[PDB]
Design a protein around this nucleic acid. Structure first.
Lengths: 113, 61, 502
DNA sequence: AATAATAGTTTTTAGTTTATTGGG
DNA sequence: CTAATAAACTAAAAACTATTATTATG
């Protein structure tokens, strides 16, 4: 869907480490922030799977103090924080996996920054 | 402590010297030794520096 | 803080850049090449924070966003790294310009409006606070666009508008067997005589690599001088001199060049687990007892007065000893932000202490966690050079005073006079060895060697540039200007068989 | 529906490491 | 019959811009 196609576009645009990549990535992140914030239950599951895939992708791929990845990562963090504001216990499968993902986010370059 | 040396004049003259430091800001003679708070000992205070890569879960270097 | 400097470099790609009245002299292309390499090295040494770009015209192959034909940009506005130096040194040399001609175009029509447009766009791309707009062309003929009157008119209109926007273009005189005349196509399209057959545009200093470093208008510290207890003066304390050294070892992994996290850790010898800040006591075992204490009161003993200045009084400058010198002198400038109206007061006190030659002795505390020392304040007036530019700022030269325990003892020395003939002998010696002082002529040869080594290894040179040891006298001219004075003074003072040693 | 501390960059910097003499 | 001593060496704390939530208003 729209979430998936934006996931693919942002999965592409980070191919290069450059300011334009970070700009496009954070712009698309804001777009998805205002998009998937709408209360959904069918697009919610699609958002769940795309979020899992692309969160792994950015954690293992952005993963750099370069601002074209750092600003996008922190925007992702803000969006997921305001998203757990409204998702309930649906993280029950995502709970431990994203716990490990996030603590590894910290222990990696995010510790250096 | 003086500076027993030789001032030199170009390549044809040199005279020994005993230099002295008139103005010499006084320092602290003893630093605050980091003793334990349980046994009051530096010996209980052992330290190390860990060079580990700032990423990859702090890969040891 | 003030803005940065934008240095724009742009050379022609034609046969004029590749030719000379004498090919032994490096062609305009290659001459521009050592100019840009030298200014890149100088910027790396001094101001390796601003942004520098490389772009070409005349090349029949172009590469730019606007797609202006024959306008090919090489490097964006960038800090000069070793990558740029090496990728410009390949074309350095008369063989390198042939490689340039092969893999890069050379010789084609172009419009100055095109390069003005692309450079304006490139400057539009930057995202930093900016102060200097400097564009440095590289060409050896003024006419080629005055030939096309429409081209000349639109180019000068664009350049005038750009300089209205602050875009400041500087002409570079370039060698041409036909000349590079001014006031023909120049002095009317450049914001600021000889036909400039030569290439003198201060290019000598542009090739003069600078081993200097200073920050951009950085404030050291601003303090507030309390007069007695309530009347306070805002003052800016600054230096015209500050110690410099080689950059500290930037630790990095020998297998990734990645700076390895250097985290230290004190831990319990009893357990091996980390020592908390509570677990550690400050100790100084005087005599037989271990005095246990902590950090807060330790610094509360280190600190004794608030950040500021506490005036002691006024005294004529004669009341200080020449050997009395604690730490290197600083400068004080009036500050009109925290206390306004202290500029009138500063001028009044400056003049009045000039009249009576009374120094302002003051109890001074720069910040917290530091003892209040005693400082002498002498009026440091404004000194105007030939062009009336202040070479000595108006204000106060602040001189620092040691303490009784801060002065070591001197064993008693004999004062055994010398005959006036010996005095005249060394007077002649020194008059022969007399010259003026200038601190820009003195350096640390060890530091210069460090800089040159770091460059040449980053430049991948076969040999480092050699630092000049100006801290050693020239023995030839030395003995030339001494002659018989040395041994004459010897026999006057020292026995011929008795050297000053042994 | 606006303003106001406020952390993020440099700048020394007091203890720290080397050793080099000066005794003993 | 072993001995300070700058020096280069770290830390290390503070000043220097410098944005940026934040009531007040609705």
């Amino acid at each position: 869907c729209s979430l998936l196609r934006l996931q693919e576009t942002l999965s592409a645009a980070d191919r290069c480490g450059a300011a334009l990549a970070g700009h496009q990535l954070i712009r698309g992140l804001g777009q998805e922030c205002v998009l998937s914030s709408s209360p959904a239950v069918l697009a919610l599951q699609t958002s769940l799977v795309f979020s899992r895939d692309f969160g792994l992708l950015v954690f293992v791929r952005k993963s750099l103090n370069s601002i074209e990845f750092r600003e996008c990562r922190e925007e992702i963090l803000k969006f997921l924080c305001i998203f757990l504001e409204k998702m309930g216990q649906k993280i029950a499968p995502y709970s431990v996996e994203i716990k490990n993902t996030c603590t590894s986010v910290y222990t990696k370059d995010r510790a250096a920054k | 402590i003086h500076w027993p040396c030789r001032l030199t004049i170009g390549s044809n003259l040199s005279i020994r010297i005993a230099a002295y430091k008139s103005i010499l800001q006084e320092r602290v003679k003893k630093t605050w030794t980091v003793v334990d708070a349980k046994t009051l000992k530096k010996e209980d205070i052992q330290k190390e520096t860990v060079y580990c890569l700032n990423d990859d879960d702090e890969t040891e270097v | 803080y003030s803005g940065r400097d934008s240095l724009i470099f742009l050379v022609d790609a034609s046969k004029a850049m590749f030719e000379s009245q004498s090919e032994d002299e490096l062609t305009p292309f290659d001459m521009s090449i050592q100019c840009i390499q030298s200014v890149y090295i100088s910027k790396i040494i001094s101001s390796d924070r601003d942004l520098l770009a490389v772009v070409f015209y005349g090349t029949e192959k172009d590469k730019n966003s606007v797609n202006f034909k024959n306008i090919y940009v090489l490097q964006e506005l960038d800090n000069p790294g070793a990558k740029r130096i090496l990728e410009l040194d390949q074309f350095k040399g008369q063989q390198g310009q042939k490689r340039f001609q092969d893999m890069m175009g050379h010789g084609s029509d172009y419009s100055l409006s095109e390069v003005l447009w692309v450079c304006a766009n490139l400057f539009s791309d930057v995202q930093f606070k900016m102060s200097h707009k400097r564009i440095m062309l590289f060409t050896n003929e003024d006419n080629p666009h005055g030939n096309d009157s429409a081209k000349a008119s639109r180019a000068r209109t664009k350049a005038g508008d750009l300089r209205d926007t602050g875009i400041f273009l500087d002409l570079m005189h370039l060698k041409k067997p036909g000349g590079f005349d001014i006031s023909l196509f120049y002095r009317d399209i450049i914001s600021i005589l000889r036909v400039h057959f030569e290439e003198s545009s201060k290019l000598e200093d542009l090739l003069r690599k600078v081993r200097a470093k200073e920050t951009r208008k950085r404030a050291l510290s601003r303090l507030k001088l309390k007069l007695n207890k309530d009347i306070v003066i805002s003052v800016g304390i600054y230096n015209l001199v500050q110690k410099a050294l080689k950059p500290p070892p930037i630790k990095l992994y020998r297998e990734t060049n990645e700076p390895v996290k250097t985290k230290t850790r004190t831990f319990n010898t009893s357990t091996g687990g980390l020592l908390l800040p509570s677990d550690t006591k400050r100790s100084q075992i005087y005599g037989s007892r271990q005095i246990i204490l902590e950090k807060e009161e330790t610094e509360e003993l280190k600190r004794f007065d608030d950040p500021g200045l506490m005036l002691m009084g006024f005294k004529p400058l004669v009341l200080l000893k020449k050997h009395h010198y604690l730490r290197p002198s600083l400068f004080v400038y009036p500050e009109e932000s925290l206390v306004i109206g202290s500029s009138t007061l500063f001028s009044a006190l400056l003049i009045k202490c000039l009249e009576k030659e009374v120094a302002a002795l003051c109890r001074y505390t720069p910040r917290r966690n530091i003892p209040p020392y005693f400082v002498a304040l002498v009026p440091q007036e404004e000194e105007l050079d030939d062009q009336k530019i202040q070479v000595t700022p108006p204000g106060f030269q602040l001189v620092f005073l040691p303490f009784a325990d801060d002065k070591r003892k001197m064993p008693f020395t004999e004062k055994i006079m010398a005959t006036p003939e010996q005095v005249g002998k060394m007077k002649a010696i020194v008059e022969k060895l007399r010259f003026t002082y200038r601190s820009d002529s003195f350096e640390n040869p060890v530091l210069q060697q460090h800089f040159r080594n770091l460059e040449a290894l980053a430049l991948d040179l076969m040999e480092p540039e050699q630092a000049v040891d100006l801290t050693l006298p020239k023995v030839e001219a030395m003995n030339k200007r001494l002659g018989s004075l040395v041994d004459e003074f010897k026999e006057l003072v020292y026995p011929p068989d008795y050297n000053p040693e042994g």
